[model samples]
Target: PMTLGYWNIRGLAHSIRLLLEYTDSSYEEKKYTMGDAPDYDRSQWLNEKFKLGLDFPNLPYLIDGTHKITQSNAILRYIARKHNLCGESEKEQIREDILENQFMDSRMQLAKLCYDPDFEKLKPEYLQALPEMLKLYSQFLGKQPWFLGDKITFVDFIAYDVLERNQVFEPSCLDAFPNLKDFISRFEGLEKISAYMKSSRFLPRPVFTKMAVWGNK
Candidate 1:
C-alpha cells in the first residue's frame, strides 16, 4: 500500500484523498497533528520530514514503494498519471492544464483570506469578487458533464475541492450557477466518492489548521 503524509487537517490533501478513493487505490494516511495554539508545533512532521528521501521534503507527501513525492499538485499529477486521469487528447490536456493552475490560484485566494488575521475585514471584498470568479468557471464548464468535457480528470478533483470550499465559505456562492451546483452533486454522487463520504476516513472539517481565522476546527 502507498502512504500519504500531511497535517491532520483537510487542506491540500483532500483532493489527493478523493482521487485515491475514486481510483480505489490501496493507501494509508500518515496524519501529523500540529500542536495546539501559541506554538502550533509541527515537530510531529518535522521530526521525520528530512528523513523521507523526498527531493524537497514537505507535507502532503506520497510514498509508494520507492517513489517519494512532495508538493500537493505534483503528488496529484503523479497519481493521476498512474490512473490515466491526466486527460486525453490535445484539447482535453490543454483544458486540464489550464484548470489545474487556475484552480490553485483560486484556492490560494481563499486560503490567504481564511488564514489572514483580518479575515473579517477582508471577507466582504472576497465575497464581492466571488461571483465573477465563479462565473468564469461556470462559463468554462458550460454544458459539459466535466470540466474537461465528458471525462472526469484530475483537474475536476481540484475544481471540486476549491469550489466546494468556496461554497462552504459562502453557502449561496453557487446559487446563480446551476451547472456548478449540478457538478458538485454529480461529483458527490460517484459511487466511490459517496462511499468515502460515508466512511470514517472522511475528514470533512477543519479545512485549515488552528492558525486560520475560520474552519480551523
Candidate 2:
C-alpha cells in the first residue's frame, strides 16, 4: 500500500488527504503523535525524519514502495501528476502554478500572524489588508467553478485548503464574494469529499501544536 506520513494533524496534510479521497485511492497515513512528558512534549516524526534517506527530510513526506518524496507542495504536485489531476495542458498547468503561488503568499502571511507572539498587534494590519488581498483572488477566480476552469484540478484543492483555513481568522471573510463561497461549497460537496467531511477522519480544527499558524482549534 502507498504510505503517506505526517504529523498527526491536518496542517499541511489536509489537502493531501482530500486528493486521496477524491481519487478513491487506498492509502494509509503514518501519524506521529506527541509524547506525554514533564518537559516539552516530543515528536515521533522527528525521530524518524532523518532516516527517510531524503535529500531533505521533512514532514508530510510520502513513500510509495521504493519512491519517497518530501515537501508538502512537491508531494501534492507529484500525486496530482501521478493521478492525472494536475491539468490538461501546458497553459492550464501554468495557470494552476500561478494561482497556487498566490495561495502560498496568503498562507505564509496568515501563518506568520498565527505564529506571532503578539497576535493582537498583528491582527489589525492583517484584517486591514485582508479585503483587498482576498478580493484579488476572487477577481482571479472570476466566476470560475475551479481555478483553471470548470473541472477541478490540483490547484483547486490547494486554494480551497488555504481559503478554508483563513476562515478561522475571519468568519465572514467570504461574504462579499459569492464566487469563492460557491466554489468552496461545490468543492466540499464532491461525492467522496462530502463523505469524508462527515467521517471521524475529518478534522475540523488544526492539529494541536506549539508552532505554526495560530489558534488551538
Candidate 3:
C-alpha cells in the first residue's frame, strides 16, 4: 500500500491522485487540514514534517515502502514509471518534457493571480493574456488525440489538471479551441477517470488553500 500526504485542498496533488486512480494503485491519503483564515495554521503537517524521513520534506509526499517521494511531478513520474505511462520514444519523451514544464508555467501564472492580495486588480491582466497562452497549447496539441500523440502519458495528467483549473477559473476559456475541448472530454471519458470523478473521494472544490482569493472555499 501507499500513502499520499498533502493539504486537504485540491492543489498540486490532484494530478497525482488522478494518475493513481487511473493506474489502479492501492493507496490511502493523509489529508492535513489547514486552519481557517488569519493564521491558516499548518501544524497538522508541520508537526510531522521532519519526522517523515523525506529528503525534501514537502507537501504532497508519496510513501511507498522504502521509497518516499516528494515534488508533484516526481511523484507523478514515480507512479507513471510503475505503469509505463511515461513516453516510449525519444520524440514522445521530448514532448513530455516540454509539456510538463510548459504546463507548470501556465499553472503558476494562475496561482500567482489567485493568491495575490490584489486579485481583483491582477485578474484583468491575467485574463487579457489567457487566450494567447491557451493558443500556444492549442497549436502544440494540433490534431493529436493526446499531447504526445495517440497514447496517453503522465504529461496528459498534468495538462488536464492545469487546463481544467483554467477552465474553472474562466468557464469559457477553451471555447475557441475545439480540439482542446475534445481532449478534455476524451480524458474524462476514460473508465477509471470517469469512475473516480463520480466517487465521493474526489475533491474538485477549493482548488487552493483558504488564503487564495479564488477557488478557496
Q: What is the C-alpha lDDT of each candidate?
A: 0.93, 0.80, 0.94
Better of 2 and 3 by TM-score: 3
On a 0 to 100 scale, what is the lDDT of residue 55 in model 2?
72
Candidate 2 lDDT trough over 10 residues, lowest sum: 208-217
lDDT score at residue 46, model 3, on the 0-100 scale: 94
- lDDT (Cα, tens digit) per residue for candidate 1, span 1-217: 9999988898999999999999999998999998776998988888998888999988889999999999899999999999999787999888888888999999999999999999999999999999999999999999999998888989999999999989999999999999999999999999999999999999978999988988895
Error of 2 at 105 (Å): 1.4
Candidate 3 residue-wise lDDT, 1-217, digit = tens: 9999998899999999999999999999999998886889999899999999999899999999999999999999999999999999999999999888999999999999999999999999999999999999999999999998999999999999999889999999999999989999999999999999999999987899988888885
TM-score between candidate 3 and the true structure: 0.98
Off by over 4 Å in 2: 35-39
Residue 12, candidate 2: Cα error in Å is 0.8
Which residue pairs in candidate 3 collide?
none
- The list of candidate 3 runs beyond 4 A from truth reads none
* TM-score of model 1 vs. true structure: 0.98
**Per-model TM against the reference:** 0.98, 0.92, 0.98
lDDT (tens digit, per residue) of candidate 2 on 97-178: 7877888888788877877878889889998889898898899889678898878888888888888877756889888988
